[PDB]
Design an enzyme around this catalytic site. Structure first.
Site, PDB file in Angstrom:
ATOM      1  N   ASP A   1       0.822  -1.184   0.028  1.00  0.00           N
ATOM      2  CA  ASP A   1      -0.060   0.108  -0.052  1.00  0.00           C
ATOM      3  C   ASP A   1       0.803   1.326  -0.038  1.00  0.00           C
ATOM      4  OD1 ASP A   1      -2.933   0.984   0.554  1.00  0.00           O
ATOM      5  OD2 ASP A   1      -1.760   2.044   1.988  1.00  0.00           O
TER       6      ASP A   1
ATOM      7  N   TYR B   1       2.840   9.929   0.042  1.00  0.00           N
ATOM      8  CA  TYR B   1       3.842   9.264   0.845  1.00  0.00           C
ATOM      9  C   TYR B   1       5.110   9.563   0.575  1.00  0.00           C
ATOM     10  CZ  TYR B   1      -0.223   6.193   2.242  1.00  0.00           C
ATOM     11  OH  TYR B   1      -1.269   5.771   2.725  1.00  0.00           O
TER      12      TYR B   1
HETATM   13  N1  LIG Z   1      -5.863   5.726   3.533  1.00  0.00           N
HETATM   14  C1  LIG Z   1      -5.426   6.375   4.600  1.00  0.00           C
HETATM   15  O1  LIG Z   1      -5.741   7.839   4.492  1.00  0.00           O
HETATM   16  C2  LIG Z   1      -4.414   5.989   5.114  1.00  0.00           C
HETATM   17  C3  LIG Z   1      -4.184   6.535   6.749  1.00  0.00           C
HETATM   18  C4  LIG Z   1      -3.064   5.626   7.411  1.00  0.00           C
HETATM   19  C5  LIG Z   1      -2.676   4.688   7.068  1.00  0.00           C
HETATM   20  N2  LIG Z   1      -2.711   4.254   5.587  1.00  0.00           N
HETATM   21  C6  LIG Z   1      -2.211   3.059   5.235  1.00  0.00           C
HETATM   22  O2  LIG Z   1      -1.965   2.037   6.249  1.00  0.00           O
HETATM   23  C7  LIG Z   1      -0.802   1.687   6.661  1.00  0.00           C
HETATM   24  C8  LIG Z   1      -0.827   1.202   7.990  1.00  0.00           C
HETATM   25  O3  LIG Z   1      -1.314   1.950   9.011  1.00  0.00           O
HETATM   26  P1  LIG Z   1      -0.561   3.118  10.033  1.00  0.00           P
HETATM   27  O4  LIG Z   1       0.728   3.910   9.238  1.00  0.00           O
HETATM   28  O5  LIG Z   1      -1.215   3.908  10.756  1.00  0.00           O
HETATM   29  O6  LIG Z   1       0.245   2.020  11.051  1.00  0.00           O
HETATM   30  P2  LIG Z   1      -0.136   0.754  11.666  1.00  0.00           P
HETATM   31  O7  LIG Z   1      -0.263  -0.378  10.600  1.00  0.00           O
HETATM   32  O8  LIG Z   1      -1.329   0.956  12.755  1.00  0.00           O
HETATM   33  O9  LIG Z   1       1.109   0.608  12.646  1.00  0.00           O
HETATM   34  C9  LIG Z   1       1.539   1.514  13.660  1.00  0.00           C
HETATM   35  C10 LIG Z   1       2.733   1.213  14.401  1.00  0.00           C
HETATM   36  O10 LIG Z   1       2.550  -0.059  14.708  1.00  0.00           O
HETATM   37  C11 LIG Z   1       3.972  -0.779  14.706  1.00  0.00           C
HETATM   38  N3  LIG Z   1       4.066  -2.092  14.688  1.00  0.00           N
HETATM   39  C12 LIG Z   1       3.962  -3.216  13.454  1.00  0.00           C
HETATM   40  N4  LIG Z   1       3.935  -4.167  13.695  1.00  0.00           N
HETATM   41  C13 LIG Z   1       4.349  -4.480  14.966  1.00  0.00           C
HETATM   42  C14 LIG Z   1       4.394  -5.274  15.863  1.00  0.00           C
HETATM   43  N5  LIG Z   1       4.023  -6.652  15.527  1.00  0.00           N
HETATM   44  N6  LIG Z   1       4.402  -5.212  17.066  1.00  0.00           N
HETATM   45  C15 LIG Z   1       4.717  -4.254  17.783  1.00  0.00           C
HETATM   46  N7  LIG Z   1       4.502  -2.997  17.049  1.00  0.00           N
HETATM   47  C16 LIG Z   1       4.132  -3.062  15.640  1.00  0.00           C
HETATM   48  C17 LIG Z   1       4.928  -0.083  13.834  1.00  0.00           C
HETATM   49  O11 LIG Z   1       6.103   0.567  14.096  1.00  0.00           O
HETATM   50  P3  LIG Z   1       7.329   0.160  13.349  1.00  0.00           P
HETATM   51  O12 LIG Z   1       7.707   0.574  12.061  1.00  0.00           O
HETATM   52  O13 LIG Z   1       8.495   0.808  14.401  1.00  0.00           O
HETATM   53  O14 LIG Z   1       7.363  -1.613  13.523  1.00  0.00           O
HETATM   54  C18 LIG Z   1       3.856   0.990  13.232  1.00  0.00           C
HETATM   55  O15 LIG Z   1       4.381   2.464  13.360  1.00  0.00           O
HETATM   56  C19 LIG Z   1       0.011   2.688   6.373  1.00  0.00           C
HETATM   57  O16 LIG Z   1       1.526   2.836   6.309  1.00  0.00           O
HETATM   58  C20 LIG Z   1      -0.488   3.404   4.819  1.00  0.00           C
HETATM   59  O17 LIG Z   1      -0.134   2.351   3.962  1.00  0.00           O
HETATM   60  C21 LIG Z   1      -3.516   4.825   4.849  1.00  0.00           C
END
Ligand SMILES: NC(=O)c1ccc[n+]([C@@H]2O[C@H](COP(=O)([O-])OP(=O)(O)OC[C@H]3O[C@@H](n4cnc5c(N)ncnc54)[C@H](OP(=O)(O)O)[C@@H]3O)[C@@H](O)[C@H]2O)c1
Ligand SMILES: CC1(C)CC[C@@]2(CC[C@H]3[C@@H]4CCc5cc(C(N)=O)ccc5[C@H]4CC[C@@]32C)OC1=O
Length: 314
Positions: free
Chosen positions: A46, A51
């Protein structure tokens, strides 16, 4: 590659790799971690114009095709139309630019990133102001449909739409393609039950972002907000199943029929997250997680809460 069939006949892997990192993270990191994600078994990737990483993410994909690890058809790549490009004449050029950056012939999925239209230009956040634009999103949708017909996007969908906004597209006269998905904030503190029920009723896949509680960026997220992965119910379930709170949060989504994204820029956590397919939650586990719902959208800022097309009823 557990997948679900989209309403246009294409297939989407149910676990996706989130590629957003804030501007302070070096751009080269996206290349490294996207390769690690593919190595770990992620196939759904994604990205978005917003980004500032499509070149790096695209290079990672090309590199894993070049070394024989995957074929293009094995990868499900998403990009998104940024909100300054909602005016219909700007949609195809925005997609073409995303394709140029990623060095890909097509995206598997192209989304309207947000219903919150912004002043056209090359400022991501146009003082300045923030400067909003009033655009009939049905016209943006018509332009998205033309992108599918041109073969630039295999599938088209939306992101951050509420039920009303989705409904406006679905009931548009002369609709050619339904959105295949609605990618929205979705996790145990904001589980989107009603929106999920609506989407399912219309053959639209709900795709969960911030499924792990978001990156808690100070620009958009209150540091006071409870930290999802510290939730005692998630921790107790992690203990019960000898997994991790993150794995519980991801598995919850799969068992509700929600496609789930997971961002990590850490090698160990990337590898861990694919373990979502290795265990199950019971009905009572799922009920315990449902009890956590508390109307908490982590993205919650003055910079957009007053936008005329802000999707939340706060
Ligand atoms: N459409 C939209 O408006 C929109 C908005 C937000 C997000 N998104 C998409 O969704 C993706 C994911 O959402 P998000 O960016 O909000 O992050 P998320 O998936 O909710 O993850 C949040 C944090 O969790 C940590 N993490 C990941 N795996 C873990 C594990 N197994 N144990 C403990 N911590 C863990 C990561 O830190 P580390 O990197 O340090 O592991 C990450 O920064 C984005 O990257 C983007 O591609 C889209
Ligand atoms: C549901 C909401 C209202 C929540 C906020 C959100 C979800 C993620 C948010 C972005 C989060 C990242 C971001 C970055 C910049 C920048 N200039 O780097 C500018 C704006 C944004 C945010 C805009 C609103 C975004 C798109 O979209 C939405 O539609």
């Amino acid at each position: 590659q557990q997948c679900v069939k989209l309403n246009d006949g294409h297939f989407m892997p149910v676990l996706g790799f989130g590629t957003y990192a804030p501007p302070e993270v070096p751009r080269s990191k996206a290349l490294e971690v996207t390769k690690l994600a593919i190595e770990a078994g992620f196939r759904h990737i994604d990205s978005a114009h917003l980004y500032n990483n499509e070149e790096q993410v695209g290079l990672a994909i090309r590199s894993k095709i070049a070394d024989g690890s995957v074929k293009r058809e094995d990868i499900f790549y998403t990009s998104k139309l940024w909100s300054t490009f909602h005016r219909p004449e700007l949609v195809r050029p925005a997609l073409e630019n995303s394709l140029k950056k990623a060095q890909l012939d097509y995206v598997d999925l192209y989304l309207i990133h947000s219903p919150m239209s912004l002043k056209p230009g090359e400022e991501l956040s146009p003082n300045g102001k923030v400067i909003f634009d009033i655009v009939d999103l049905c016209t943006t949708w018509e332009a998205m449909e033309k992108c599918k017909d041109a073969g630039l996007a295999k599938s088209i969908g939306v992101s951050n739409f509420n039920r009303r906004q989705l409904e406006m597209i679905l009931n548009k006269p002369g609709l050619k393609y339904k959105p295949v998905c609605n990618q929205v904030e979705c996790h145990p503190y904001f589980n989107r039950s009603k929106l999920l029920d609506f989407c399912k009723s219309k053959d639209i896949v709900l795709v969960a972002y911030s499924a792990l509680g978001s990156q808690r960026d100070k620009r958009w997220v209150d540091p006071n907000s409870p930290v999802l992965l510290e939730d005692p119910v998630l921790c107790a379930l992690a203990k019960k199943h000898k997994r991790t709170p993150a794995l519980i949060a991801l598995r919850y989504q799969l068992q509700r029929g929600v496609v789930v994204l997971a961002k990590s820029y850490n090698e160990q956590r990337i590898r861990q997250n694919v373990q979502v397919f290795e265990f199950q939650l019971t009905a009572e586990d799922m009920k315990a997680i449902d009890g956590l719902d508390r109307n908490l959208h982590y993205f919650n800022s003055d910079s957009f809460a007053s936008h005329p097309n802000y999707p939340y009823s706060d």
